[PDB]
Structure formats: C-alpha cells, structure tokens
C-alpha cells in the first residue's frame, strides 16, 4: 500500500465514507479509534481489539514519554512490536495532556516545560521533540504539536493560542519532513484551533491548508461546551478544511456526538469513554446506555444488548457482568470493554453502510429515536 | 460418560497418573485446578482457562454464597452456565474461609455462624447447608463440610476437631445422598484431618473410608508448617487413604510442593498462587520464579519463559509485561495469569508424561536442579 491515500467512495450531505490506505493497513471511515493509554487498550489483548472491528488505535504520547519512555520503546522495536498491534496507530502530540495531567507547566514560544505527575521529574516538550517522540514510537499518523485553547476563551486569548498553534504546526511540519524515514512512512495531521469563533477557525484552516497536511483535525472541542455548541462550531468549521483529506474530531466519542459529527463531515473519532465505561459499569446499547451495576440487572439473563454481535453478548448475561463489576473483578472490565468497543465499531459500520447506501440521514433519525 | 470413574493408567513409586471421568468431562491426573474466587478465574475468560490446558476449576463456596448468592445462581441456571465454563467444577465446602475471612464466627456441633466480611450479615453454615449450596451451584465434585484444624495444634484439640469433622463427613455424605439429582450426577470427596499426628490421621482415614467417598482429600496441610513438615505428614498420611480413589491435597500449589506431593501419591491440586502471582508480578519459569517488576526486565525482549508454549510467551516480551505491571494495567494481570496457569498445566503434563513413561523420579530430580 502507499504511505497515505484517502479516498471517498460515497457521500450524503456533508457525510462521507471511504478509506485511508497506509503501509500497515487500510482504515475504513468514518472510523472510531480505541485508545491505548499506556501502550494498551484497557483490559484487551490487541487481537481482541482487532476482533471488535477496529482498523486503528490511538496511542497517547504524553503517557508513553513518561512511563516507559520514547527512547526505550524505540530500542525495544517500536510501539507496534512492543504492544503487539501491527496495524496503524495514531499518536496525539502530548501537548494536551501536559496541560491537563502534568503539573507546574511553564509555557513559551519554544514549547512547554512540566513535571511528571509520576516522578515529579521535569520535561521540555516542543513541536520538534513531540514529532521525534512520535517517530521513536513508530507512529503511523503523527499529530502536530499544538496548544489546546481552554473553554471558555476570549477572542484575543483564542487568537493568540491559535496563532501560536499555527506557528507550532509549521514547526511540526518541518520537523516531520526533515526526518526521512518518518516523512516517507508516516502521515502528519494538522489541528485546527480558534475556539468557538468562526473567523479564528477560518484563519486556522487557511494557515493549516497553507502548510499542507495529510489530514486535518478539529481541535479544542472536547472541552465541555455542550453538544449544541460543539455542533454549531462544527457546522461552519469542517467546511473550512480541505475536502479531499480526512477530518478528525479529537476527543469526541458519545454515540450521538459521533453521528452528529459525521453528519457534519467528520471522518475520524477517538475516546476513552468506551474503555472507562468498562469499569464504571456503563454499557452501550441501541436503546441507550445502561449502568450494569443497577440492581435491576442482578437476574437479567439477556445479553448487554439484544442485537450486538460481539463475543460478550453471545456468551455472557447482564446478570453475570453485573456480578463481576460489583465484585470488582478484572473479567468484568474485560467483558464490558470488549462489548463497548464492539458496539462502537458496529455503530461506525452502520454509519459507513448507510452512507454508501444513501440512507444515513434516515439511519441517524432512527438511531436517535431509539437511543433516546 | 459415567457420574464418576477414576482409573489409574500408570504408576511409579507412590506416583500415579490416570483419569477421572465425569459427566461434564475427563480430568487428567495428576491435575492442577485453577481457582475461580467469585465465579471467575481472575482476569481470564473461561476459554482462555481451557486453552491453558485446565480440565477442571475450583469454585469457592464461601464467596459465592455471599456475593451473588447460592439460590440466585441456581435460578440463573447454575455456576457453569453463569460463568461460561461447561467442564467439571470442584467446589470447596466454605468451612475453611468462614474460619479465615469471616468475622464473629460461632461454632457448634451443628455448624458455624458468621458475619459476612462484606455486608456484616449473619449466616449459619452446616454440613447440610454446605452440601445444598454446592448443589445449587451445580458443583461436579462436592467437598464434605469440615473444620480445618489450626497449626500448630495440640493432640487433644486436633483429635476433637478431627472427630467432629468425621461426624460432619457422615452428615455431608447423608445430605448428599438424600438429594437424588446430586447423588446421581455429582461426586463427593471426604477430607482427612488430624493435623501432623499419625494416629489421628489414621483414625480420620479409617472413618472416611468407613463412610466411603468418591475421592479423599488431605486437609489441614496448607497452614504454614513448612514443606519438610508437610512432606513428612504426607509420607504416612496418603498411604492411609484408599488407593483406588483420587487423593486431593487442598491449598497446595508451589511447583516444588506439587512435584513432591505427586511423589507421595497426590492426584489433585489447587491454589491461587498462580492467579495472585499475576498481579504481584511473580512469573513462573523452569529456572525458578522471577518478579517481572524488577528493573532488570525493563528491556528484556525474551518471553517470560524460554520454553513455555503459552500464547503470552509467543506474543509478548518480559519488557512489555514489566511495563504493564508497574503501570498497574489490567492487561498485565491478564498476561501474567494466563502464563502462570499455562506454566502450571505444562508442569502437570510433564508429570503425567514422565509417570506414564516411568521416568518421573528423574524428571523430579531434573526439575529441582534447574528450578532451584
Ligand atoms: C480528553 C479529550 C482529548 C481531546 C484532544 N483535543 C486536542 C486538541 O485540541 N489539540 N491536541 C491534542 O492532542 C488534543 N486532544
Ligand atoms: C488457602 C488454603 C485453602 C486450603 C484448604 N484446606 C482445607 C481443609 O483442610 N478443609 N476444608 C477446606 O475447604 C480447605 N481448604
Ligand atoms: Zn456486545
Ligand atoms: Zn508462557
């Protein structure tokens, strides 16, 4: 296959369905990417992740550069080899988490300095170092290093951050291109910022398109602005991005959000909601999510979801999983996570199928009526 | 298959190898039984447990009667259906754990009263109620309800407890036989007591043989007396039990203990050591156990064990598992537990093969030289 080739096979309104071809495999879009926090998709073997239907997973750079170490993983043969996943892997830049989990972060035009929330040790992450770390990990889709603008944000603050991210985007681009092996085997995604402001989003989009990237992400929307607000921003933001390249909405994962996002032109998604919902007891069903810990499920012999075709719904009951979660057993988290990720992949498949068949709008309507 | 049929195919010294045929399947002996504490073999799907080579697992009655409830599991279709394991299941009587984990236990000739270490609720466990609970769970091999004698124990105290357990054994036997469906589809094992005293062990054995059971367990030896002492007791205790029936050493699982126990006539084993060793970081190898958390394994690309043929040793390195455990990831516990249980099953296979080939004594010598 080629280094990177995105092809749109069908459309309906702003929705698109197609594929991204990469050296390690093909990614069907719209796509949902399970998240591997510390080089592991929580409670699942890589084969199980693939069995759910996932074509690609997301690796968190921040965590990896700390816990095991970028240099160490490279010496061990790279992330794919390390964790046993041989398909594409998209890694975030680490910038976001550094501004969330890290402590005593010092930001400048050069990058960000911070103390690990583990060893308390210091680190200086920059566009150049972020790109290098993602290379060391052997990432297939590299995210440009940026600064996620806090919500709410004033027009001036949002402008400054956006302008800086755009400057950092250029640096990421040049850093990526100078590394021959990386530039030739991996792809680079730029990230649009600008908060909820249209003019800022347009400037960011022009600058990003000006730089030129393999894909474009809509950043800064996984900040708690509400679905209505998020949708509003997506309405005018996605059209600004180049149409012939993937559109990746970072950190958005609720099912209804995904459907609405695809209706607005998004091709890629990622979220820990599915995995975290494995331990908290939240299981996704076509009739809406349920909390398996609820007493009403203690003797429910039915599977998590009546239609889901995942291995969990074929073999175990709600009653058993209810028991497992309340008892704090690891198997509970394993079964809940496999189901939820399988559910998500089934959702993406139904979206891809309905787009290819020109009945996505109807699917969305049907989905919402039942889900809510 | 029959309700229960134990056949010895080969011998060497006191060691035996053969099979136990039961309705739900055949059990190869000597056998190692993975433990399912709360209706789950820690961090493993039933299929994975079977994939390691296990022919039977052990279910803990104490825990089950509390967390999910005996009556509830029966209404849900039984333990096999509940957890998804369709092969034989041996359940302990619950008496032991009640004297270990429980609180405010009141003991009498009728049974034992206690408060759950969970809800603090009270319960009265007796030979009759224990047998009933194991029936409700759908246990294939039922353990007689007894009183595990504390170590150290004076001759008089050990005698009284043993004599009482023998009285309880008769009650278990009658309770089991009165329940037609149970008596016809499940087996009942009596448990020998008597602490470290030969005459007490002999009395217990005669009484147990007098009652008549499908198998005989050597109880009271998983109390911290030391391998030397345990071996000493096994030397004169096992020969006391009927030769044509299985000999089950309860709670003994260290590899060297298993080998030495088989050399002394034991056919069945069980232990949480393998599972608990999954989280603590202890991995069994033919060169002795190792603690995967040790820094020397951070960049070790080799599998947990150079010879092990389990799925974990084929796919992941010590370096990766080292990372997983120190990072506290669920996958770490999953991989460590699959390997350790697979290692145990490989041990049992090597024991069965060496017995059938009349070279077990040599195998034991070779095993120890390398293991230690
Ligand atoms: C918990 C939600 C994470 C979503 C996210 N947004 C962003 C963004 O806007 N810029 N860069 C990033 O790595 C990033 N990650
Ligand atoms: C943690 C070790 C458990 C071993 C055990 N011994 C015994 C025994 O001697 N009698 N009855 C039992 O259930 C039992 N379980
Ligand atoms: Zn399912
Ligand atoms: Zn192994």
């Amino acid at each position: 296959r080629p280094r990177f080739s995105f092809s749109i096979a069908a459309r309906e309104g702003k929705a698109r369905t197609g594929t991204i071809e990469m050296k390690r495999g093909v990614i069907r879009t719209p796509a949902f990417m399970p998240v591997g926090t510390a080089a592991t998709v929580k409670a699942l073997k890589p084969e199980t992740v693939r069995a759910t239907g996932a074509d690609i997973i997301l690796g968190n750079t921040y965590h990896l550069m700390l816990r095991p170490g970028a240099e160490r993983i490279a010496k061990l043969g790279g992330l794919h080899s390390f964790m046993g996943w041989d398909r594409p892997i998209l890694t975030d830049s680490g910038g976001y988490q550094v501004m969330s989990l890290s402590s005593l972060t010092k930001q400048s035009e050069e990058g960000v300095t911070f103390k690990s929330h583990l060893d308390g040790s210091r680190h200086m992450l920059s566009p150049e170092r972020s790109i290098e770390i993602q290379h060391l990990l052997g990432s297939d889709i590299v995210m440009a290093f940026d600064e996620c603008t806090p919500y709410p944000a004033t027009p001036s603050r949002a402008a400054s951050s956006m302008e800086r991210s755009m400057r950092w985007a250029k640096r990421s681009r040049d850093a990526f291109d100078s590394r021959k092996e990386q530039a030739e085997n991996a792809a680079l995604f730029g990230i649009q910022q600008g908060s909820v402001f249209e003019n800022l989003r347009q400037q960011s989009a022009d600058a990003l398109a000006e730089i030129g990237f393999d894909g474009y992400a809509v950043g800064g929307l996984a900040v708690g602005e509400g679905q209505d607000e998020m949708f509003r921003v997506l309405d005018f933001s996605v059209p600004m991005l180049p149409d012939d390249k993937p559109h990746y909405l970072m950190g958005v994962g609720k099912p209804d959000d995904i459907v609405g996002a695809v209706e607005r032109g998004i091709d890629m998604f990622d979220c820990v909601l599915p995995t975290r919902s494995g331990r908290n007891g939240q299981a996704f069903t076509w009739d809406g999510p349920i909390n398996i810990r609820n007493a009403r499920f203690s003797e429910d012999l039915k599977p998590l979801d009546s239609e889901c075709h995942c291995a969990v719904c074929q073999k175990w009951s709600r009653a058993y999983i209810h028991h497992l979660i309340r008892a704090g057993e690891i198997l509970g988290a394993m079964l809940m996570t496999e189901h939820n990720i399988a559910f998500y992949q089934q959702l993406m498949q139904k979206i891809r199928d309905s787009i290819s068949e020109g009945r996505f709008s109807q699917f969305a309507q049907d989905f919402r009526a039942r889900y809510f």
Side-chain angles (χ1 to χ4, degrees), chain A residues 303-305 308-314 338-340 342-343 346:
Chain A
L304 261 15
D305 176 273
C308 179
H309 59 204
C310 84
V312 181
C313 291
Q314 311 181 309
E338 182 175 348
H339 164 74
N340 284 334
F343 178 84
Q346 275 162 285

Side-chain angles (χ1 to χ4, degrees), chain A residues 282-296:
Chain A
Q282 170 182 51
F284 293 101
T285 83
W286 295 106
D287 294 294
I290 60 177
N291 193 308
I292 200 61
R293 294 182 57 98
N294 190 294
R296 62 166 165 284

Side-chain angles (χ1 to χ4, degrees), chain A residues 202-280:
Chain A
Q202 180 64 69
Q203 289 170 50
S204 183
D206 299 318
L208 254 27
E210 180 41 49
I211 304 294
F213 287 96
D214 296 309
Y216 303 77
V218 179
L221 290 188
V223 294
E225 66 272 32
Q227 172 182 289
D228 298 318
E229 184 64 358
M230 180 184 84
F231 280 3
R232 188 177 71 75
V233 180
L234 285 181
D235 290 320
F236 63 64
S237 293
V238 186
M240 302 178 176
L241 310 170
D243 186 87
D244 65 348
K245 307 295 184 182
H247 306 331
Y248 166 31
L249 181 54
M250 301 181 95
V252 175
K254 280 186 295 166
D256 182 25
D257 285 349
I258 280 45
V259 174
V262 170
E263 290 176 298
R264 296 170 172 67
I266 293 63
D267 311 297
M268 298 167 68
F269 302 82
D270 79 271
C271 205
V272 289
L273 205 185
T275 58
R276 56 179 50 178
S277 293
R279 270 210 57 185
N280 55 51

Side-chain angles (χ1 to χ4, degrees), chain A residues 149-154 158 162 193-197 200-201 219-221 233 236-237:
Chain A
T149 311
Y151 182 72
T154 66
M162 178 278 268
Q193 289 302 321
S195 190
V196 307
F197 311 107
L200 255 36
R201 285 281 172 186
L221 290 188
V233 180
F236 63 64
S237 293

Side-chain angles (χ1 to χ4, degrees), chain A residues 60-359:
Chain A
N60 286 147
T61 290
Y62 175 68
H63 295 290
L64 294 166
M65 67 176 92
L66 289 177
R67 186 79 73 174
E71 281 61 31
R72 177 168 289 170
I73 290 181
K75 294 181 66 293
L76 266 33
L79 186 54
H80 293 83
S81 173
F82 190 57
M83 72 184 287
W85 172 267
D86 62 22
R87 284 172 180 281
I89 287 179
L90 181 156
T91 52
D92 53 21
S93 57
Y96 186 88
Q97 293 62 34
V98 176
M99 290 307 293
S100 302
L101 292 52
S102 177
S103 298
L104 299 182
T105 59
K106 195 176 184 181
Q107 309 172 68
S108 70
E109 183 64 16
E110 187 60 8
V112 54
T113 296
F114 62 103
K115 286 186 177 178
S116 177
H117 59 292
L118 290 67
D119 301 62
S121 50
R122 182 195 300 177
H123 302 293
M124 158 51 99
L125 202 51
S126 60
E128 296 76 18
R129 174 59 181 173
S130 176
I131 295 302
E132 178 181 47
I133 292 182
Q134 298 180 64
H135 163 70
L136 284 169
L137 295 175
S139 167
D140 299 280
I141 296 73
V142 181
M143 296 309 296
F145 179 86
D146 69 336
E147 171 178 286
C148 185
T149 311
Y151 182 72
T154 66
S156 66
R157 299 191 85 285
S160 292
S161 302
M162 178 278 268
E163 300 171 320
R164 163 168 284 175
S165 285
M166 295 311 92
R167 292 197 288 280
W168 280 359
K170 174 53 183 169
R171 287 167 61 183
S172 295
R173 164 50 77 183
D174 295 326
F176 179 100
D177 296 333
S178 296
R179 200 180 303 283
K180 296 193 301 293
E181 180 185 358
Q182 177 168 48
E184 301 175 14
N185 295 295
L188 214 212
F189 276 29
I191 310 172
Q192 184 199 213
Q193 289 302 321
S195 190
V196 307
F197 311 107
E198 194 173 343
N199 67 314
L200 255 36
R201 285 281 172 186
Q202 180 64 69
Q203 289 170 50
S204 183
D206 299 318
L208 254 27
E210 180 41 49
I211 304 294
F213 287 96
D214 296 309
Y216 303 77
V218 179
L221 290 188
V223 294
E225 66 272 32
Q227 172 182 289
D228 298 318
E229 184 64 358
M230 180 184 84
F231 280 3
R232 188 177 71 75
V233 180
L234 285 181
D235 290 320
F236 63 64
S237 293
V238 186
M240 302 178 176
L241 310 170
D243 186 87
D244 65 348
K245 307 295 184 182
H247 306 331
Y248 166 31
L249 181 54
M250 301 181 95
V252 175
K254 280 186 295 166
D256 182 25
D257 285 349
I258 280 45
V259 174
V262 170
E263 290 176 298
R264 296 170 172 67
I266 293 63
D267 311 297
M268 298 167 68
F269 302 82
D270 79 271
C271 205
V272 289
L273 205 185
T275 58
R276 56 179 50 178
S277 293
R279 270 210 57 185
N280 55 51
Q282 170 182 51
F284 293 101
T285 83
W286 295 106
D287 294 294
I290 60 177
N291 193 308
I292 200 61
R293 294 182 57 98
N294 190 294
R296 62 166 165 284
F297 298 117
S298 66
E299 313 193 322
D300 196 335
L301 282 310
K302 299 185 298 297
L304 261 15
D305 176 273
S306 65
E307 289 168 36
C308 179
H309 59 204
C310 84
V312 181
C313 291
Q314 311 181 309
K315 308 177 184 185
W316 299 280
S317 69
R318 291 173 167 180
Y320 181 55
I321 298 178
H322 166 86
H323 159 65
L324 257 23
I325 295 301
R326 292 182 56 143
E329 288 285 343
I330 292 301
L331 182 62
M334 293 162 66
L335 258 31
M336 283 286 288
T337 302
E338 182 175 348
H339 164 74
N340 284 334
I341 290 183
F343 178 84
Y344 267 78
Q345 293 308 328
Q346 275 162 285
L347 170 60
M348 304 320 290
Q349 189 59 240
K350 286 175 177 288
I351 290 180
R352 296 193 289 266
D353 287 335
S354 64
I355 300 289
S356 301
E357 291 172 7
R359 56 179 179 75

